[PDB]
Design a protein around this ligand. Structure first.
Ligand SMILES: *[C@@H]1O[C@H](CO)[C@@H](O[C@@H]2O[C@H](CO)[C@@H](O[C@@H]3O[C@H](CO)[C@@H](O)[C@H](O[C@H]4O[C@H](CO)[C@@H](O)[C@H](O)[C@@H]4O)[C@@H]3O)[C@H](O)[C@H]2NC(C)=O)[C@H](O)[C@H]1NC(C)=O
Ligand SMILES: *[C@@H]1O[C@H](CO)[C@@H](O[C@@H]2O[C@H](CO)[C@@H](O[C@@H]3O[C@H](CO)[C@@H](O)[C@H](O[C@H]4O[C@H](CO)[C@@H](O)[C@H](O)[C@@H]4O)[C@@H]3O)[C@H](O)[C@H]2NC(C)=O)[C@H](O)[C@H]1NC(C)=O
Ligand SMILES: O=C(O)CC[C@H](NC(=O)N[C@@H](CCCC(=O)Nc1ccc(F)nc1)C(=O)O)C(=O)O
Ligand SMILES: O=C(O)CC[C@H](NC(=O)N[C@@H](CCCC(=O)Nc1ccc(F)nc1)C(=O)O)C(=O)O
Ligand SMILES: *[C@@H]1O[C@H](CO)[C@@H](O[C@@H]2O[C@H](CO)[C@@H](O)[C@H](O)[C@H]2NC(C)=O)[C@H](O)[C@H]1NC(C)=O
Ligand SMILES: *[C@@H]1O[C@H](CO)[C@@H](O[C@@H]2O[C@H](CO)[C@@H](O)[C@H](O)[C@H]2NC(C)=O)[C@H](O)[C@H]1NC(C)=O
Ligand SMILES: *[C@@H]1O[C@H](CO)[C@@H](O[C@@H]2O[C@H](CO)[C@@H](O)[C@H](O)[C@H]2NC(C)=O)[C@H](O)[C@H]1NC(C)=O
Ligand SMILES: *[C@@H]1O[C@H](CO)[C@@H](O[C@@H]2O[C@H](CO)[C@@H](O)[C@H](O)[C@H]2NC(C)=O)[C@H](O)[C@H]1NC(C)=O
Ligand SMILES: *[C@@H]1O[C@H](CO)[C@@H](O)[C@H](O)[C@H]1NC(C)=O
Ligand SMILES: *[C@@H]1O[C@H](CO)[C@@H](O)[C@H](O)[C@H]1NC(C)=O
Ligand SMILES: *[C@@H]1O[C@H](CO)[C@@H](O)[C@H](O)[C@H]1NC(C)=O
Ligand SMILES: *[C@@H]1O[C@H](CO)[C@@H](O)[C@H](O)[C@H]1NC(C)=O
Ligand SMILES: *[C@@H]1O[C@H](CO)[C@@H](O)[C@H](O)[C@H]1NC(C)=O
Ligand SMILES: *[C@@H]1O[C@H](CO)[C@@H](O)[C@H](O)[C@H]1NC(C)=O
Ligand SMILES: *[C@@H]1O[C@H](CO)[C@@H](O)[C@H](O)[C@H]1NC(C)=O
Ligand SMILES: *[C@@H]1O[C@H](CO)[C@@H](O)[C@H](O)[C@H]1NC(C)=O
Ligand SMILES: [Ca+2]
Ligand SMILES: [Ca+2]
Ligand SMILES: [Cl-]
Ligand SMILES: [Cl-]
Ligand SMILES: [Cl-]
Ligand SMILES: [Cl-]
Ligand SMILES: [Zn+2]
Ligand SMILES: [Zn+2]
Ligand SMILES: [Zn+2]
Ligand SMILES: [Zn+2]
Lengths: 694, 694
């Protein structure tokens, strides 16, 4: 039989291991020759594996690179302008790789050039509320200061935007051991911790879904018209640079001015964590100077696009996509995910060669330049937008397969909750102590739902990965899954060696997954979800699950508003229309489910499968959210304060945020009411797509 | 047999006549009780005629009305402030109607209130090029003047916008006999001409597709959030009022200052047509004073929505829509069209009762408040946007069935050209001298195509009617058809009695169509087009016709650019990408047509019917055109200078218009190139929706 079980059994741990080793011996930075060569290897192998067609799709996009002969660094300088302390020019390379060339040194992609000099202010994680504490309560003015902030909690791009709007003239980012050094474990290469010389790379853009900074709305093809740099989307206006904790201790240990406001501002180094501004009396005439000479450059990138044509609905598309570009070797991010995708293509190709074909079309993607702002996925989607919105069933992401070895993590649309519950009950737990049990049972036990006893936690989608264009711009049902840690020690960050030269094959094979059994389980989850979406006669979405979370999100946003009872009275602020819409959605979804259970007729089928496919699409507003025209989904957007986190009823949440500080309350409460109207209307209009059609 | 011929034969001239008489005995102004009563009569009769369901859909929208106890008028005033001349307060009512109440007096809907006094400037038709002549060549400054302009050539809304941007402080509109009095024919009631006391009503908004001024993007339902008047879309900022030619002769005959620049500025009255400013020496101290006291008011409106459910594809919608609201009796506009729709519902209902059903769903609409800015259609479409864009096959408009008795007029998407050719070859000509010939033969003979010998003229869609939201916002294939005049005498205007109290049942029965045979022919064209769209197994669109007009539009816009050869060299302006895209569209459409001819398989069918339905949809850009976000179609928008006329490649046309006057040529030619890119990309993306799907 050619069924899901044949698909699942053909997947092997040992194949994933081999592919990961093959993908991680040299660096594969976006825009470099070595990343083009790997694209040409993936294309050739997906053809040999059996896919019907495999194409490169190339774009010319804005990327960012250090100057090889004029290196980036930071200094303490004295009254004479002598540089008495210099940060490192490179991470000490790991054992056996000390001769690999073309390792890009640590830098903040898209930093402007500059050499600003000034006094230091310490701003904790540089979150919105850190800057509120500094300015409103401690009365400390960051204007014309250089700010130093610790990585963690929120996306680094939001930190840079916050610092810019507080008047900073530069930003220094560092990895504190409190957030990237787990108690009791050793530093690479003898453990999975971050050493004092290790540094986190990453881009610092605020794109809000735009894609290539020069071509918002349209693909960066051969004849494209480009904005000038001055009108580019999302570039920072002050220089920025990342450092490790040995270097950071040298910048922090002389800090003066005010004491830290409380123990949530203190990391683990042996320094007071004074906020500043500037250094204590003996050193008060010394200063910090940045030297940044990175350049922005239009550079060609290459996506790989494989097609397995459907036997019955070739015009319905189920997409499995993840990126291939890495900061250096990409041992976890992204090659642990790309090796899993490779094995998934190989198993579907095995079945194809014995004569099987899925019911719907499957598209397989190896995205480029994800690390520089989700550019390869966003440009391809802009090119193919009309095809994706009338034919796109679902999108399953496939970046890192592990960030821990404790239990499963799923983030997805409510439409996939029931699918994920049923598949995981059918899979074996790889966990010690759960031999012979289901993945559902071990996951449910280690990560209980906050709401329903006997069910596992499934989170909302945020952003900071390649599903953003599919879900929050086009409104295609999306999900992601990987193995994760128990969020007990460093509960405010990813893994210690994230975006560092120490992220290697050896990191994974020695410390995360020596038997490759967590990788195999994640391949069965991603692959199994794609198999069902592409082969089930009725699409495996349950509209009633959307009805339940919409009631939760409405209770939550009403609760935030009800902290302001006097203003809700004065400006006649009512949530009645939103609760009415959610009630109608609940009742219409219930009746739709009954009909879906009673019906030999392929039109009624294809009509009802189209109602399921177009339900995620119904939550899209073609006018977008305020000042973020590429965030079009009215239920879910990335938090305005943290691109990694999801926010529910984002238009209303943002109208209410910090509303007590607004100068014209009548105007601000007017905009709350406008956002209530838009949300109620949109929920009611989505419910009506599930009514009988005529 | 239940086929198109049974449908067509059940239609009767005598039924249309009866319905027109029934719809035109009292006034049916939007927002009034009498228009609600007629909606309740239409709903009840469409039910009795057999439709499966018939509903009212109501909205609360901004309308505009004169003050009953404080009438609008204009004066000449002397140095003392004595009013020595007053314009009429009402049109002399026609024979037999001199006791009908509730006839709204002539007014410009949505005029602000005011009593400005000043000197007159005469501005011909108030077109863009009239104001260019005045300011650039004659050096006449309209700032702080009252302008008087003759109706004709362009939509009155564009005249008001042009006058406002030239600094006018009020606008007077009049009907000149040169444009509304046909040589050799008598004045109502002894002929179809406009008398000296007759006046054209109409709105003067610049909505650019928004719908209700207070609720752009969203339906004006019970809980809607409304903008304040100051942020409303499209309201004029200076007072405006319409007058007849007896009153106009009194305002024009004393005009002084410069002579008219040439004979295209002179109408037919016995006056010099001096441009001004102000009156000649004896009267040079007299002035013109307006008195305007109309008020804007949120008022309830009612659409009627009838449904005939499809037997095989109930989730595919073919819409027949026209408005019901009138300025006074609506003898031509709109009831000659609404009576035709009534008879069409009755014939489809006859077939339904003998047990027939169309293959696809048919939706029948009686729109409200079209006369106040296409408000009823636009609000319903905003409410139902998600349903219309995934399920909408086509939209057939149905306002006035006649504006003459000479030959047929069709304006439609290229996708319907072949459909219209084949149907008209099957219908009988009602024209004298063509007895026993086809409608195709008589139409082709009286209105030859400018391009192809042996074919009739079919025009592009413009705007100023209820198809605007369906076609230029949502991208649903649209068309319209009616009987028209030979454009020999008044070739720059509709019919003489347009929007006047003289537009009566008697106007039609005595002078336009005494046997109702032109009405019956227009019912067979509209009805026949709806029958085919709803019942043909393969949708009756030919993608190759789009390929041919796209080459025409590209040649045309290139020709406009090539008037500036030196700038095209200096800024590297190339149309190569657009011509490339059009070539690809031609070749892909040709191969698609072959496949559509070779294929027992309903999926391949439904896949190919969806490619045909979504092809018009592919021309939509979700970012809209510059500053006109509700004009989203990249091939067709309403002219920026005249809402009635269509423009092709509108983004490029507007970037090029008057470009030699722009101060920064580099920036202006940069925007031309951006628009070339958007058009090329969009044409290529539309072609690719017709490629094989996988
Ligand atoms: C959820 O689903 C229900 C459908 O079961 C839907 O109920 C609708 O509520 C609206 C109110 O928004 C009702 O609208 C009324 O329609 C009648 C005519 O049938 C009108 O007469 C009413 O207007 C008068 O009353 C108003 C209320 O005080 C006055 O302020 C106004 O000036 C008028 O005098 C009113 O427009 C509608 O009838 C029901 N539909 C039903 C019961 O079928 C509800 O709206 C849905 N929720 C959302 C968010 O859409
Ligand atoms: C109409 O249809 C045709 C398809 O039949 C389509 O042709 C495509 O044209 C583009 C040019 O826009 C070609 O793109 C090239 O791709 C190759 C790789 O296959 C690249 O090496 C090329 O880049 C180099 O050359 C450029 C040109 O001078 C340099 O400026 C550049 O820096 C690079 O060195 C280039 O990107 C593409 O191959 C064809 N596709 C084919 C033939 O299949 C055409 O684009 C369509 N028209 C529109 C408007 O879409
Ligand atoms: O430009 C972008 O949108 C993201 C590019 C890139 N994307 C990623 O690296 N994404 C990783 C992020 C993993 C690390 C992480 O989850 N950190 C984290 C920290 C705090 C918090 F609240 N949430 C997540 C992923 O999705 O697996 C980046 O974040 O620099
Ligand atoms: O608000 C709007 O968009 C239009 C509302 C209303 N619509 C109409 O009356 N439409 C008529 C217009 C018929 C008269 C006409 O065609 N005049 C005309 C004059 C000059 C020119 F170039 N084109 C058309 C129709 O489409 O049958 C109006 O124009 O005031
Ligand atoms: C990763 O695997 C690929 C595929 O096996 C290797 O590329 C092949 O190398 C052999 C020997 O040089 C050649 O015969 C083929 O032409 C290559 N095939 C391709 C590119 O598809 C590649 O060398 C391996 N890389 C590492 C680092 O082990
Ligand atoms: C997940 O599994 C459950 C339990 O088998 C499925 O729900 C059943 O579906 C069948 C067939 O439609 C019904 O007749 C049963 O009554 C359902 N049981 C229920 C709702 O408790 C559910 O549909 C599956 N979800 C998917 C495939 O998305
Ligand atoms: C137009 O036709 C309608 C329908 O025949 C007339 O309305 C009907 O009038 C009769 C007699 O008063 C009543 O019995 C019905 O209740 C009405 N039906 C409706 C409203 O559906 C209407 O009076 C005619 N109008 C004119 C001006 O002749
Ligand atoms: C309009 O009528 C023409 C002529 O009958 C149709 O074109 C023919 O269609 C048949 C059936 O598909 C083909 O086998 C013929 O070869 C076609 N003749 C041609 C193209 O000259 C045309 O399809 C009709 N248009 C419609 C229905 O939209
Ligand atoms: C890199 O740095 C040197 C200065 O030491 C400079 O001359 C060269 O132009 C730079 N390269 C760039 C900006 O790409
Ligand atoms: C830091 O680097 C600069 C430039 O290369 C140099 O002048 C200075 O001596 C260095 N300082 C130290 C302490 O190494
Ligand atoms: C912060 O500093 C600058 C002056 O250098 C000033 O423009 C800004 O208003 C200051 N804000 C304060 C002191 O709150
Ligand atoms: C792997 O699992 C063990 C068992 O709890 C744990 O102690 C170890 O820290 C895990 N490795 C990583 C990298 O989390
Ligand atoms: C109509 O006009 C009179 C003035 O003569 C005024 O009192 C009344 O308020 C007006 N009605 C309005 C503005 O609706
Ligand atoms: C015009 O109307 C005003 C106000 O009703 C009046 O004072 C004046 O006498 C009128 N003029 C003429 C010539 O009728
Ligand atoms: C038109 O008149 C006003 C002065 O009353 C002035 O502001 C404007 O610039 C003038 N334009 C001319 C004279 O060209
Ligand atoms: C009706 O047709 C006749 C025949 O040419 C024409 O002379 C007459 O003017 C027409 N009526 C109208 C209203 O155009
Ligand atoms: Ca782009
Ligand atoms: Ca609206
Ligand atoms: Cl992922
Ligand atoms: Cl992190
Ligand atoms: Cl019409
Ligand atoms: Cl007109
Ligand atoms: Zn990644
Ligand atoms: Zn990453
Ligand atoms: Zn009309
Ligand atoms: Zn009209």
């Amino acid at each position: 039989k050619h069924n899901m079980k044949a698909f699942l059994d053909e997947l092997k741990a040992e194949n994933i291991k081999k592919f990961l080793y093959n993908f991680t011996q040299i660096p594969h930075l976006a825009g470099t020759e070595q990343n083009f060569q790997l694209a040409k290897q993936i294309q050739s192998q997906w053809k040999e594996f059996g896919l019907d067609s495999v194409e490169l799709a190339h774009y010319d996009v804005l990327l960012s690179y250090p100057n090889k002969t004029h290196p980036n660094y930071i200094s303490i300088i004295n009254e004479d302008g002598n540089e008495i302390f210099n940060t490192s020019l490179f991470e000490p390379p790991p054992p056996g790789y000390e001769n690999v060339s073309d390792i890009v040194p640590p830098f903040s992609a898209f930093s402007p050039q500059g050499m600003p000099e000034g006094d230091l202010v310490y701003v904790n994680y540089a979150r919105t509320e850190d800057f509120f504490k500094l300015e409103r309560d401690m009365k400390i003015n960051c204007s014309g200061k250089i700010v130093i902030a610790r990585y963690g909690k929120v996306f680094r791009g939001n930190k840079v935007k916050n610092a810019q709007l507080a008047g900073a003239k530069g930003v220094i980012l560092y990895s504190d051991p409190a957030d990237y050094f787990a108690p009791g474990v050793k530093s690479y290469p003898d453990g999975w911790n971050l050493p004092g010389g290790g540094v986190q790379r990453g881009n610092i853009l605020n794109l809000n879904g735009a894609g290539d900074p020069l071509t918002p709305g349209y693909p960066a093809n051969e004849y494209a018209y480009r904005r000038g740099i001055a009108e580019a989307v999302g570039l920072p206006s002050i220089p920025v640079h990342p450092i490790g904790y040995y270097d950071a201790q040298k910048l922090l240990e002389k800090m003066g001015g005010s004491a830290p406001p409380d123990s949530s501002w203190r990391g683990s180094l042996k320094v007071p964590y004074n906020v500043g501004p500037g250094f204590t009396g003996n050193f008060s005439t010394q200063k910090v100077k940045m030297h940044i000479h990175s350049t922005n450059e239009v550079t060609r990138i290459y996506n790989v696009i494989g097609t397995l044509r459907g036997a019955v609905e070739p015009d319905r598309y189920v997409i499995l996509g993840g990126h291939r570009d890495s900061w250096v070797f990409g041992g976890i991010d992204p090659q642990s995910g790309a090796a899993v995708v490779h094995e998934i293509v190989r198993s579907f190709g095995t079945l194809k060669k014995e004569g099987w074909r899925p019911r719907r079309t499957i598209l397989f993607a190896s995205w480029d330049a994800e690390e520089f702002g989700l550019l390869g996925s966003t440009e391809w989607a802009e090119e193919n937008s009309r095809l994706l919105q009338e034919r796109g069933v679902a999108y399953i992401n496939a970046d890192s397969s592990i960030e821990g070895n404790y239990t499963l993590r799923v983030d997805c649309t409510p439409l996939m909750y029931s699918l994920v519950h049923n598949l995981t009950k059918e899979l074996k737990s790889p966990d010690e102590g759960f031999e012979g049990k289901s993945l559902y049972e071990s996951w449910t036990k280690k990560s209980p739902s906050p709401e329903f006893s006997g069910m596992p936690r499934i989170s909302k989608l945020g952003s900071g990965n390649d599903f953003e264009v599919f879900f929050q711009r086009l409104g295609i049902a999306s999900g992601r899954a990987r193995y994760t840690k128990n969020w007990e020690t460093n509960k405010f960050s990813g893994y210690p060696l994230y975006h560092s030269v120490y992220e290697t094959y050896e990191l994974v094979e020695k410390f995360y997954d020596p038997m490759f059994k967590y990788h195999l389980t994640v391949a069965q989850v991603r692959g199994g979800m794609v198999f069902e979406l592409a082969n089930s006669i009725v699409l495996p979405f349950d509209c009633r699950d959307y009805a339940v979370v919409l009631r939760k999100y409405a209770d939550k946003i009403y609760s935030i508003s009800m902290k302001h009872p006097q203003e809700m009275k004065t400006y006649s602020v009512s949530f009645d229309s939103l609760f009415s819409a959610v009630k109608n959605f609940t009742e219409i979804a219930s009746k739709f489910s009954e009909r879906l259970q009673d019906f030999s007729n392929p039109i009624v089928l294809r009509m009802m499968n189209d109602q399921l496919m177009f339900l995620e699409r119904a939550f899209i507003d073609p006018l977008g959210l305020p000042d973020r025209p590429f965030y079009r989904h009215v239920i879910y957007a990335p938090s305005s304060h943290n691109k990694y986190a999801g926010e529910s009823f984002p238009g209303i949440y943002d109208a209410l945020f910090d509303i007590e500080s607004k100068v014209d309350p009548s105007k601000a409460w007017g905009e709350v009411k406008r956002q209530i109207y838009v949300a109620a209307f949109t929920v009611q209009a989505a419910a009506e797509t599930l009514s009988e059609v005529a």
